[PDB]
Amino acid sequence: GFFTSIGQMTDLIHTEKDLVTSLKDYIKAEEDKLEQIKKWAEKLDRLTSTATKDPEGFVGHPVNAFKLMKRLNTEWSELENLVLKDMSDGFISNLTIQRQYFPNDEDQVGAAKALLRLQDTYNLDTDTISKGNLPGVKHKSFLTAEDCFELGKVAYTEADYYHTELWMEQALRQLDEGEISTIDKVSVLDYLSYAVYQQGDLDKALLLTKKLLELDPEHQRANGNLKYFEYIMAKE
């Protein structure tokens, strides 16, 4: 367990809240820099447009050459400096310091396993867990497709292919409902086809392999699995 006391939990939860305030202040600092740069851009747009609309008049009046040489020689360097200016040091410094108190990879895996143990103990469906349809979770937390994928991957590492299958199917389900996510169906189908084969369902593993190959026709292992499944089945 990552948490060694209630006070530790309280302190970290409050710290995260404070980090959101710090993040909002960073956003304001970037917005202010960007507003400055946009003003500068508009002015430069006007200046260059004004030159091309009367080129003979432009060269004919000497303030124009003087201002143009100075702008290119000097002003664009000032603008460059502003573009390069870092606005994130305050927020990043703060986050860096607070990370002293954060959990790490081992704690995140630990927490995933504890969720899986809960699911096993009470025989909870993946959909009930993901939608937060449990007392004390409802409207507090819900799982993304990528969270489902991660829990599936954790089960996979324990050789629990039963829960691998269930969680990968849940991920795939949410992707089909139209969830925008960083995980791709090909990754989910890779694990799902493998778990289903371990669970002794030959037909289903073949089918899932075919779905994968529809999305990624040159996936090497899936092509090999396709040939393998077909060979084994032809002999039964």
Partner: peptide, 9 residues
């Protein structure tokens, strides 16, 4: 002849 599935990922 084909080979049995390797680990995913």
């Amino acid at each position: 002849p084909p080979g049995p599935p390797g680990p995913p990922g």
